[PDB]
Design a binder for this molecule. Structure first.
Ligand code: TYD
Ligand code: TYD
Ligand code: MG
Lengths: 354, 356
């Protein structure tokens, strides 16, 4: 069958959907994936046919409302949910023209969107085909829905709907230990890494003679490796000469790490958990703060109060030196390993149209 | 488990192995794929961790012996198999130092090589882990083995072997109607397309009103220009699939379903793409080791192989493939055979059975 996948504005949204997308293609299905023009290369380099949902940069959707007025940046977790609901909503509305043009000529039998790819809901409803929503991290996929329904109220009304429709199937990748009690029924799925890849160098997959701390933005007897965009790493290399910096495929390097330090990146969190590696979360905005708190409260992470070289250092020492954090992290890895494989989940997609 | 895949010197070899490699990764395994430095970007852009087996291009192994002395190109179909055995043999030998260094730090539990990725056989033997050979086109995977075994004598003797070791498992993608009688036992697999991708434009996945003929010469870095000039008589839309460095790289998996004929140079994976989508094909052989396998597709009735370089030969063959329904009927028959074969996902379980 023909399946349209809809990712969003960031590479993690392509990566999180890639396992199920490639699983469907491996099962003989014809698969297209959509994302903003800037994300198209990430779809293509995941080996997936790529369509642009819009030729506008995401900042257009983030920093201004449907009228063109400035959007006040969120100062709190609660403000962040409403903020995210609205701008993902705006990006979804701006995605519809391109998606109609694609689907008039290549008609999908099913549409799969990520957590906040609301254009998938709209295009499926327009076409009269099942809408599948896949969680693209361990955070609640539905957490921005109220704001998103408001943002898309015009489009939803045109479809005879009062709010965002419930999906025909919710595919969740959140380990049972981390799922909140109010989580809606899901077809569970084992997450696997499918991040951007590079030519591998030995340091990436070889464990060193000292503990290794990976730092990414998406005192201690240890080495620090910086996982960042290559474009950024060039300038970073001048200011910090003797430190590994550049895009390093996280699935490859994380098994060599004692700690993964990140900004609250959902997919980085999954990579660390999956590998059984303790993680340090340093809040840098975003709505994944809450999902990070759950990992910390489970005992497989520490979330620090302040973004400080000082506060981070103490936490790193704790994650390395107290065996419990790695213990809980391996526990989460095992929970992930016990979930239904993407190959099996393709069967649930087939069942929706047969 | 850890699984090392070994591709070769051309993009088609990466693409052919990418379905099983990604099925393995989708199943929780840690998967690395090796190939010559020039192929590393193709591995990376298939979403697979990529290691270089050598820093030399495939042209190096093709055009020179081990001492650097020039070797001529084959002139006959018979010379092709022998010549290919030797250069694949040389490339395998030149891959061993890089593979030894990778596997000392990332030790695979299992090694998967394509049809003529002989370094996979060699490294698996060195490591004492199972070696799996996966056919990377519908041609006989073993067709260059005698010549490769001669080329690899020193390496094989070092391992206490007289010839290339048999795989622990052979994984075949050749549909039944095209398998020769002498074919060995195999775990069958449904081939799926996994070619390089680009941003799609409507013309790639929308067919027009008139028939559509795709022309290609493959993905290895003239004769394309003549093929299009032949098409000029027929009332057909012509699409040219070629390297970027319409005209350009167009993902074959996407556009072939909109075509009525695929015209190509005798490339194994292009043939598979056409057959898989049920599309008749015109094979215009430009050397290589797939020639006779293309003839099988010809003999079955799902293609025509143009005997030689003749003006209007391509044109008349195209006309016959468009207006005689039998070619597409046979092509759809091959498509159905492929679709009945075990999924890459099922094949991962057979790989697992080799180490579990
Ligand atoms: C920076 C970087 C990211 N990645 C991948 C890992 C994750 O799949 C993804 C990051 O997603 P995520 O952690 O959600 O961060 P953000 O959305 O803020 O970018 O990118 C690498 O593989 N290597 C790298 O060097
Ligand atoms: C030139 C070109 C190649 N390809 C892909 C299709 C096949 O998987 C592969 C060609 O492989 P193949 O036909 O075996 O020929 P060769 O070994 O000479 O490259 O490259 C495209 O998808 N689009 C293109 O425009
Ligand atoms: Mg409103």
């Amino acid at each position: 069958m023909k399946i349209l996948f809809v990712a969003a504005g960031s590479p993690a949204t392509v990566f999180a959907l890639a396992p199920l997308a490639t699983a469907a293609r491996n099962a003989g299905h014809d698969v297209f994936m959509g994302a903003v023009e800037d994300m198209v290369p990430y779809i293509a380099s995941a080996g997936i046919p790529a369509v642009a949902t819009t030729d506008l940069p995401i900042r257009h959707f983030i920093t201004m409302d449907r009228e063109g007025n400035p959007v006040r940046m969120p100062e709190t977790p609660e403000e962040e949910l409403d903020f995210a609901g609205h701008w993902f909503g705006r990006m979804a509305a701006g995605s519809m023209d391109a998606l109609r043009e694609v689907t008039a000529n290549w008609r999908p039998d099913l549409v799969v969107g990520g957590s906040m790819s609301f254009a998938a809901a709209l295009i499926a409803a327009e076409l009269g085909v099942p809408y599948v929503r896949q969680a693209w991290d361990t955070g609640d996929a539905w957490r921005t829905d109220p704001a998103a329904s408001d943002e898309l109220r015009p489009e939803l009304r045109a479809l005879g709907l009062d709010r965002l429709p419930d999906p025909a199937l919710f595919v969740d990748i959140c380990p049972p230990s981390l799922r909140p009690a109010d989580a809606p029924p899901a077809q569970m799925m084992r997450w696997v890494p499918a991040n951007g890849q590079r030519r591998l160098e030995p340091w990436m997959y070889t464990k060193g003679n000292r503990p290794r701390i990976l730092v990414t933005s998406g005192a201690l007897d240890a080495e620090v490796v910086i996982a960042t965009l290559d474009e950024v790493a060039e300038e970073l290399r001048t200011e910090l000469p003797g430190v590994r910096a550049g895009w390093v495929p996280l699935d490859v390097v994380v098994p060599t790490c004692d700690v993964v330090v990140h900004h609250a990146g959902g997919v980085t969190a999954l990579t660390a958990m999956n590998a059984g590696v303790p993680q340090l979360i340093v809040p840098q905005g975003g709505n994944f703060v809450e999902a990070g708190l759950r990992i910390s409260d489970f005992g497989a992470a520490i979330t620090v109060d302040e973004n400080t070289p000082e506060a981070v250092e103490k936490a790193c020492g704790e994650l390395i030196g107290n065996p419990s954090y790695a213990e809980r992290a391996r526990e989460l890895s095992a929970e992930i390993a016990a979930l239904p494989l993407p190959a099996e989940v393709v069967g649930a997609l087939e069942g929706l149209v047969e």
